[PDB]
Amino acid sequence: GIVTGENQNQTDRNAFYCLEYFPSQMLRTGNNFEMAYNFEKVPFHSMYAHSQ
Amino acid sequence: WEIEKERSKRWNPEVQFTSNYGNQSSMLWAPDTTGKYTEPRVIGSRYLTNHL
Amino acid sequence: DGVGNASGDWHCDSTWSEGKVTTTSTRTWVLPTYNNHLYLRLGTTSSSNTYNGFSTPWGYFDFNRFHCHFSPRDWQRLINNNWGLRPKAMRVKIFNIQVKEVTTSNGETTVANNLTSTVQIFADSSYELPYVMDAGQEGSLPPFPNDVFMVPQYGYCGIVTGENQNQTDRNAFYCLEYFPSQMLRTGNNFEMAYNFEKVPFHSMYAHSQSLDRLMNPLLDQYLWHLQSTTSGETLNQGNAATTFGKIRSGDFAFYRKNWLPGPCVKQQRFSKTASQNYKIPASGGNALLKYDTHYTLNNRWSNIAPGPPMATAGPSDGDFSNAQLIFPGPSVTGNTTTSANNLLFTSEEEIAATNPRDTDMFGQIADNNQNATTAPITGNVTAMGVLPGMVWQNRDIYYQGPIWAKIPHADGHFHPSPLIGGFGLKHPPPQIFIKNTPVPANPATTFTAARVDSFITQYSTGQVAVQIEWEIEKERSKRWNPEVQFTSNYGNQSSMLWAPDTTGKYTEPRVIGSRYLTNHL
Amino acid sequence: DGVGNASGDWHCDSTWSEGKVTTTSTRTWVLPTYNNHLYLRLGTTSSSNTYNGFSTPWGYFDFNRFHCHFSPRDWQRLINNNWGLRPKAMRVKIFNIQVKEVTTSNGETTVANNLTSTVQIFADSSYELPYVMDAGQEGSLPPFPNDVFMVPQYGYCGIVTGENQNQTDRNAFYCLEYFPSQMLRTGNNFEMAYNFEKVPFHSMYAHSQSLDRLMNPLLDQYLWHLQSTTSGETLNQGNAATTFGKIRSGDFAFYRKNWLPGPCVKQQRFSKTASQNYKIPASGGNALLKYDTHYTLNNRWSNIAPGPPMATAGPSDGDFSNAQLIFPGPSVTGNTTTSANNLLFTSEEEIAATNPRDTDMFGQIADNNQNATTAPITGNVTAMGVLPGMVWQNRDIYYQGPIWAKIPHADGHFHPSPLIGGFGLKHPPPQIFIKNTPVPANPATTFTAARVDSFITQYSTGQVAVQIEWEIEKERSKRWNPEVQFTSNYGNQSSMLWAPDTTGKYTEPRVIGSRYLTNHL
Amino acid sequence: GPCVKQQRFSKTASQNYKIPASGGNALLKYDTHYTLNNRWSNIAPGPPMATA
Amino acid sequence: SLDRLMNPLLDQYLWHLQSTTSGETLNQGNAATTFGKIRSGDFAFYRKNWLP
Amino acid sequence: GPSDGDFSNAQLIFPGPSVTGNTTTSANNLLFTSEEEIAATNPRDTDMFGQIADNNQNATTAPITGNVTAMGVLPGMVWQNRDIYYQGPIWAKIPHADGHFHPS
Amino acid sequence: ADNNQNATTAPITGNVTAMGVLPGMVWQNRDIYYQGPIWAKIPHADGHFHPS
Ligand SMILES: Nc1ncnc2c1ncn2[C@H]1C[C@H](O)[C@@H](COP(=O)(O)O)O1
Ligand SMILES: Nc1ncnc2c1ncn2[C@H]1C[C@H](O)[C@@H](COP(=O)(O)O)O1
């Protein structure tokens, strides 16, 4: 998290995120989890060296 | 829960509940180095002003 | 519609929705007769202050500041609960025109209402004139709705060649009377509408993460780096064996990072305590303008302020630079002060996460290539343009600061955001010009071709109404602990702040920006 | 509609029906320019008089008194024939606006009509402002239709912390120019309507029965009580034998009763003859404020007056308390008088049936538990809250008294009736604010950002019309003998009462409440 | 709930204090009574309160 | 504040007893009842519609 | 106020972060509820409701006024309820009974 | 509690013989009896409290 200056001490700008505050899925030995994702259009990595 | 948005014509800024704790060796309202979670201060619900 | 029918009503309230906020505000204005109805060129030859241009009989409405449209509470609702703001649309109405004539008799000015006199107003939509409304100057609607303000005069600077006043053939003269307008009498009213072009939300929030810390503190990198070229803690002594090592948690300065901090232009640092500063004259051979950072444009020095967005000291800190906007305080009087306590200092330090500090360098870059004989040398970097994969955050808007600016028409731009603050636009809200149509005095009975220089002394007054639909974004974060808010902590006061005092005077006690809510990178 | 077309007509008559009465009344008003168009905060540090707040350029219409809407005869028709009254609906119209300018020349003020000047009026329906119209203060429409009145200034007190002037951050500032209004010229007129919320009929009648007498005088109760603990008529002597007995007609104090008299707050009793009172300074260490009954709110004493409804002396009686409203008499002059004969005293003594007397205790309650050794002891009860099965009757309205009041927005109430009198409402008739839109004087030719402090001196005038539909209940009793009525018994008078005198002055000779007809519990 | 204290009388005649039936000092005076228009009236049974 | 619900500028049409004697000392004076109008600046003596 | 140098049973008391073991000799550890926002409509807990005239004076008898330590509700009385707290309870059950007054 | 104690002043507490109703107060009405009355007429008046 954000460090102000060279010192450890937190200020009021710092944030704490409790991962248990988010809805999840509880799985037993028969359950399974699945998700899908679609990358956003992004330029082709150009794999080649220039000959000029 | 059912709530009512404040609808006042007050001009100057109302009081708010903000974190003024300032520089802290450990963030308040968050676990400490030993994992213990405590509530640093008691805070009621009355901040916004209204008129009789 | 008539002499005895008011042409409009007083609208001045802000209505809130979850998606958007619409702020209407009305003021009363008074418009004199500038320059006795006649254009005047302007110019002065100064070393760096050299300018030339015209001053016009016309005057205009400047709506560009935030407190024109927002009451402090409405500004508190906004910045506390919302991540972003951009104007959707604008609307303006001018009505209740009242044209007065003044007659001095025995040293007594007696104002008498004049019905048939007109007033002529046009909004310039085609951007065919110099646009001065965004320059960050005075003349805006007052903050406080009861105050009544004086419409500013319109004049426009023009291209200066070198350090000399003299115009060349590239200069331009714009006659505002060459544009079609609308002539209004006491029954007529003027109205226009405008639609802002889509522009990115001003992000009102502070980052809760620093760039260099974007990693996971627990793990290590699979990357390796050179730890040292020799044993021992002293320089230029040891056994001179290259030691390669893994990048392990606890050494976070050596991590390989995907992004870089924002650009820099270093600024001079001045101390608010007068004893610490070095003695700099106001003007002369060696003057403060020279030692501040300034770009040289056609042999004319000009300060770079506020300059590119860079982290700044806190408002109460004992130093400041030209990177911090300065506003007058409540207790200030008469254009000059010897103590900084009166003044109210803008501070950017929330952007210290992604941006370098204004009074401190961007970094240090290796100057040479060492060998066993040559020791390494590293110079400071005072100025750094943008590089690929660089991130920065724009300067913050303020309750006193300007809303927008006009992107100068030019072949190229980079990241068009106004360095003072606000919203860069190609087609900003059009300036609205107004003047009192001249009424001649008693003419001679004979005929003469020379123009008539004697006029009835007049002025006009009336109302103006502004409506701007704003579009906002509610904060949607999972942060646990309480965020910072803008609250009134002023405490016990002999007189309420943000309200008139015993003498009726209204001032703004403190300068407050829009960044309170935290967010993460 | 035009300069030469009157915008409204003079309506001022009351029309009666068996179900309801509708009273219209019109007046002429004159509105100055308060505070030279600018807000001013107010405050003073006093031990118990400490206050803070603002004074505004605005002014408002106060319709809240009964004689605004009723002529004495119309008030006589009402209270003589009817048991109850409550307002059904209200309507208000402001018209015939005339805005004048005044110009002082050689010490001569010459008023000249100004057509294009405006006036701006808004009614606050959302109750977004401090509501001062019910506080029981001056500024109401005059009683007599010919008189023309001066619209009062609007200012509002605010929360006082402790005994000190100084505001804290809980205080609020309301800018009346932040609300949308309506700007009126000499042809425009303003109109609004209102619907009172259902509220219990004010019961205008006196009870013909006393609570303790609600029984049948002929019969006896089947209940038994302890008559005496000993023989003989002397205390602490006898044979000490408990004597139980039946409750038999002729002893009515020992009856078992289903109901209790109303609450009490004892008041101090002052005699109108100056020789009988004990000498009390006006202000000082020991002052009259201390010895009167007062609630201590945040270290600030405040009288309790009139206080809860309690029986009071007759108007002509030789004593009075703060429980009796006091009105100025016809012969009073100059804010002070040394003789009570001039003054006109409200009297509640009709409620002596159900309520205790203000200057006398609620009763006496047994202090201890006696035994053969210990004699019984009984203390007075000076203050008693409400208990189950308690009945009381509210304080009476008066022809000079207020019509309504606003129930303060709060978490809880009990029996919301205004202690002065009238109808407690959650949403009372909305205040109507009016001010003269400022007209600037001759401006400078140059530009300056500071606000313009020089204005044309103006005032306005016009008419106002009020209509309130009242709902009434005809008396429906089987009483045989003639009831009391409100009649004019004044007899031979050198000058008619309730009418102008030889000099044109109209005063109200006597204060008369609404309770004449008897009814039974 | 609310209270109005009452006097306590013992059924054994020897324990009570000797109170005449009517006179200067009478039982009506020493019982709890509300004064209505200068007329004393007992408060009985009075508000609901626990009893022996 | 409740006791401040009024308008600080105006006055009440009501009258009250200001003092029973002249002078600032208790139990001394000429013992003349002084009635007066309720005027702005004395806010403790206002007639108020509500109680704390 | 919470930081004031006095308190009563009218103020709820919550344990602080540094408190340990069911007992403490210093109030600084504890966190005190404070109602002082209701000082507008309500009397102070440690101070009287007011002072009520005890007798009826005459030329011989000086007036006497007693304090009021306890006052039930009267007609035309206004008050504001105690505030909820982030640690405080949400609800309560109105006891089943013949009568209530202002069930909060 | 009658007064506000300090190191010098000892606390003093008076009895409460009469107490009206307060917010959040509960009580139960007096019981009917086989010999007792069935009803009563609520006296016609401007106000009542808990008409039993
Ligand atoms: N103030 C301002 N005006 C106009 N254009 C700007 C401004 N700031 C940044 N930009 C440009 C530069 C970014 O690449 C892009 C983000 O647009 P996005 O909408 O986030 O996709 O817009
Ligand atoms: N003046 C005033 N305004 C508002 N509410 C009041 C007022 N006086 C008493 N009440 C409340 C208290 C009673 O229990 C009830 C009677 O309403 P009823 O209509 O008789 O059924 O209304």
Residue numbers in the entry:
A (entry chain g): 370 to 421
B (entry chain k): 682 to 733
C (entry chain h), D (entry chain i): 213 to 733
E (entry chain j): 474 to 525
F (entry chain k): 422 to 473
G (entry chain k): 526 to 629
H (entry chain j): 578 to 629
Article excerpt on this structure:
Adeno-associated viruses (AAV) are single-stranded DNA packaging viruses of the Parvoviridae and belong to the genus Dependoparvovirus. The virions of the AAVs are composed of non-enveloped capsids with T = 1 icosahedral symmetry and diameters of ≈260 Å. They are assembled from 60 viral proteins (VPs): VP1 (≈82 kDa), VP2 (≈73 kDa), and VP3 (≈61 kDa) in an approximate 1:1:10 ratio. In this study, the structures of the AAV7, AAV11, AAV12, and AAV13 capsids were determined by cryo-EM in an effort to complete the panel of available structures for the defined AAV serotypes.
For AAV11 and AAV12, the closest related AAV serotype is AAV4 based on VP1 or VP3 amino acid sequence ranging from 78 to 81% aa sequence identity. Surprisingly, the structural identity between AAV11 and AAV12 is 98%, which is only surpassed by AAV1 and AAV6 with 99% sequence and structural identity. In contrast, major structural variabilities (vs. AAV2) were seen in VR-I, VR-III, VR-IV, VR-V, VR-VI, VR-VII, and VR-IX for AAV11 and AAV12. Most notably is the 5 aa insertion in VR-V for both AAV11 and AAV12, relative to AAV2, but also to AAV7 and AAV13. In addition, both AAV serotypes possess a single aa insertion in VR-IV and display a different conformation to the other AAV serotypes with the apex of the loop positioned over part of VR-V. This subloop of VR-V and the alternative conformation of VR-IV are responsible for the broader appearance of the 3-fold protrusions of the AAV11 and AAV12 capsids. Similar to previous observations, a structural comparison of empty to the full capsids for the individual AAV serotypes showed them to be largely identical with overall Cα RMSDs ranging from ≈0.2 to 0.3 Å. This density extends into a pocket underneath the 3-fold symmetry axis and has been interpreted as deoxyadenosine monophosphate (dAMP), which is positioned between conserved prolines 421/632 and histidine 631 (AAV7 numbering). In the AAV serotype structures determined in this study, the histidine side chain preferred the “left” orientation in full capsids.
